[PDB]
Amino acid sequence: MWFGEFGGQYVPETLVGPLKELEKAYKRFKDDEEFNRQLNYYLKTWAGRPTPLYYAKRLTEKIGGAKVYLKREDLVHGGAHKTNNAIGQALLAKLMGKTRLIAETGAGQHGVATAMAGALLGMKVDIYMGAEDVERQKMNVFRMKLLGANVIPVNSGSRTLKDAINEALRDWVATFEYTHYLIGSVVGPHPYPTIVRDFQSVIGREAKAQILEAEGQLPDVIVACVGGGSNAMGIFYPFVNDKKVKLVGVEAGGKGLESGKHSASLNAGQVGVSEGMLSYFLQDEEGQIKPSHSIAPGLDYPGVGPEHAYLKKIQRAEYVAVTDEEALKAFHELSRTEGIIPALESAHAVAYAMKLAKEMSRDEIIIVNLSGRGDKDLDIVLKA
Amino acid sequence: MWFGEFGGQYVPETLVGPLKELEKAYKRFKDDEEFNRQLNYYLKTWAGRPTPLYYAKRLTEKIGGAKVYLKREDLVHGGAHKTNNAIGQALLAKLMGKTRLIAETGAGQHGVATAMAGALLGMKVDIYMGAEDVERQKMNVFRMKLLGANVIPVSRTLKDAINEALRDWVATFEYTHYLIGSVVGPHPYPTIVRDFQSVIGREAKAQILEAEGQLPDVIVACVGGGSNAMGIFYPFVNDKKVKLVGVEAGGKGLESGKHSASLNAGQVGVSEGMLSYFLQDEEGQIKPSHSIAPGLDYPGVGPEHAYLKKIQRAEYVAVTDEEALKAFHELSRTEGIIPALESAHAVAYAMKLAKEMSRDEIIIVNLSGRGDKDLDIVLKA
Ligand code: NA
Ligand code: NA
Numbered sequence: 196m197w198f199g200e201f202g203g204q205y206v207p208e209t210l211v212g213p214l215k216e217l218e219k220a221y222k223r224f225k226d227d228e229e230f231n232r233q234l235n236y237y238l239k240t241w242a243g244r245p246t247p248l249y250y251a252k253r254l255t256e257k258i259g260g261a262k263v264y265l266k267r268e269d270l271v272h273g274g275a276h277k278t279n280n281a282i283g284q285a286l287l288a289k290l291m292g293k294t295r296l297i298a299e300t301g302a303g304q305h306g307v308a309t310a311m312a313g314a315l316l317g318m319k320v321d322i323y324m325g326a327e328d329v330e331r332q333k334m335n336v337f338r339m340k341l342l343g344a345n346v347i348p349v350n351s352g353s354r355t356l357k358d359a360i361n362e363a364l365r366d367w368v369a370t371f372e373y374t375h376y377l378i379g380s381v382v383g384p385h386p387y388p389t390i391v392r393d394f395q396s397v398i399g400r401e402a403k404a405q406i407l408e409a410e411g412q413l414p415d416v417i418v419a420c421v422g423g424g425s426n427a428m429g430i431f432y433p434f435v436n437d438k439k440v441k442l443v444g445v446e447a448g449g450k451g452l453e454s455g456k457h458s459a460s461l462n463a464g465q466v467g468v469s470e471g472m473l474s475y476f477l478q479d480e481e482g483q484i485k486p487s488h489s490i491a492p493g494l495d496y497p498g499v500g501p502e503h504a505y506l507k508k509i510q511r512a513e514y515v516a517v518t519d520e521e522a523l524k525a526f527h528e529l530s531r532t533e534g535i536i537p538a539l540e541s542a543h544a545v546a547y548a549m550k551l552a553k554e555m556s557r558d559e560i561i562i563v564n565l566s567g568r569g570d571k572d573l574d575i576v577l578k579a
Numbered sequence: 580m581w582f583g584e585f586g587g588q589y590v591p592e593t594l595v596g597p598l599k600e601l602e603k604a605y606k607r608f609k610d611d612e613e614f615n616r617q618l619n620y621y622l623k624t625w626a627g628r629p630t631p632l633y634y635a636k637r638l639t640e641k642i643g644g645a646k647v648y649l650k651r652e653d654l655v656h657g658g659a660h661k662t663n664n665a666i667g668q669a670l671l672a673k674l675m676g677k678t679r680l681i682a683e684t685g686a687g688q689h690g691v692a693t694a695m696a697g698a699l700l701g702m703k704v705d706i707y708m709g710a711e712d713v714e715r716q717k718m719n720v721f722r723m724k725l726l727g728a729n730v731i732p733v734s735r736t737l738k739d740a741i742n743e744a745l746r747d748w749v750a751t752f753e754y755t756h757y758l759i760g761s762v763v764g765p766h767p768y769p770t771i772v773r774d775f776q777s778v779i780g781r782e783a784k785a786q787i788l789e790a791e792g793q794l795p796d797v798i799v800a801c802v803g804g805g806s807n808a809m810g811i812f813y814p815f816v817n818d819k820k821v822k823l824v825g826v827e828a829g830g831k832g833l834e835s836g837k838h839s840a841s842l843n844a845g846q847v848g849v850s851e852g853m854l855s856y857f858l859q860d861e862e863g864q865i866k867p868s869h870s871i872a873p874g875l876d877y878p879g880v881g882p883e884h885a886y887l888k889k890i891q892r893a894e895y896v897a898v899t900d901e902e903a904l905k906a907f908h909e910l911s912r913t914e915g916i917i918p919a920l921e922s923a924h925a926v927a928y929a930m931k932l933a934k935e936m937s938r939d940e941i942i943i944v945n946l947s948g949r950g951d952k953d954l955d956i957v958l959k960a
Binding site for chain 1: 694722
């Protein structure tokens, strides 16, 4: 339940039971030969795992320092790492005997991932989306409708991801008998942060095998973008006990850390309770959760996963920020140099890895998690 | 050069030299250790090959008939099989000492695939695109711009761009490679493109043997020019028991005069440097084609598919625009795969054939692309 001083189950007594059952179900199926066979089969034949580890020779040679490798989560079915978790929790829910999936979404990528997995396994999908996010993401809303999922708009509060998350929890209390709440990051009450991380750990496990095969050694640095922290925990977790491997999470620096217009929870936030967890949250002087900003909608969350809060306190992972402008330059650079259009979320990771590569030895190795493809982001890259 | 009676290099003397020098280079590299090592490395680490072979169990049991496997070219980098051919020709170009790639596109897809492959290999990419095609497909124009390609605006259709690109190549062939996005045109393009897409059928073979212990009874692929169909078909061509079915665009209807089916209702002729079936009027001028799927909207068809209809090795059917849209929606709701409207044609015909077959039998449908590109078109309907 706890990652050092961070995490927990900060929920009403109505949710304690549901989460008890979820936890008992996960303990059972986590190691069940049939669950893991099914999960592995769907990840291989349906998602297209294992994703490749691509050596960006031209980017590497242009910067003239560290070998830059890209973990290509952009190539997974749906175009984002979110599919790995979406499949895992939908299979669990199915085996738990649930018939309906509910999910929060802000970017819409978790909504699409939940809708695909719900369509794959023949479950009803209800996507609680902030009313502001629905109008922001008209195309992703259409994809979800084509996949057979209903977008239920959340009109409460900031009408964003925070509000969508709590509306969904209020439904789950009523519906938990026949419904699994499918959380799309390493956030929320226990056991969600552990489950989401366990289902994203496949990224790191592949990437470790692939970098040992390609270079015959572990990476010097692993760089991943952090919204809630699922793709980052995914690639980090298997290297956590490899002490020489440096872990760097890149949060949304937005319009600048000094601007107040960002999502860098771990850089600028204060320890607090929201969405049923004890973690770093952007807070005003009064102590209320402040609004977040990122050009990358997937990094636009005021909070961060508790396990990242733990990794920051023990100083196992360093957390940095990249601005909207640095991310945009990286979006263009990776496109022109490697013919790969990265998600704006992922372009944060690429932006920091490029600055870090320049300062580093030619023999040294950076793995960047390329969390998604940028097809969904072309309109906003156009506007800028 | 020849696929029985069909094929050839039916081009002006100015293009004969370039095509002969390309032909000599392909011979050199097609079996070279280093070329194939470099190509396989890019297809593996950049493109994400091999793509999976997916059993659509919910679709299969819903039909009640044969097992429906989907070959998932939707999951290759760029979201279409076209990447396999783009990498192949682009790397060949680089090893030939070419510094520039040029291509033509209307739909935009082949433009993007060339831009991606060009960027990967650090070669200049000039895409010729008709001003009328540009305005319709503004997002693919940005995509190419992002990928560092120079989109050169040109009835402002595909034709006027092809002629502009053939005038470019005649001059620039010394440092430039013309990248062709289907098994069409003069020799050696129809052979080269099929060879670079054949990887689909070799993967699909090993994968279906691992899965079901036996080769498929039928293989179903959509057919515009016929690269994705040739890619999955070709390795299985010698396996006599394996039936091959290409699906063309039945459009508004095969009798409606708004289709793109060349192998059904087309007459043998010489256009675009090749001897193959084309959609022709009474006068025998090439008629315009219509398909809701932009990739299937080609007046003609590749010569090797003409050869396969002639020796009756491959049956060639059309599916209506309406049937393909029902297939697009069905596969999305049933298997949570949003297919390309191109691919949906193959899926639409696969759903008919399955019901009229035994539950023990196997259909492999080539899912040629993902339907992210075709969302604005499906919204219209
Ligand atoms: Na954050
Ligand atoms: Na045709």
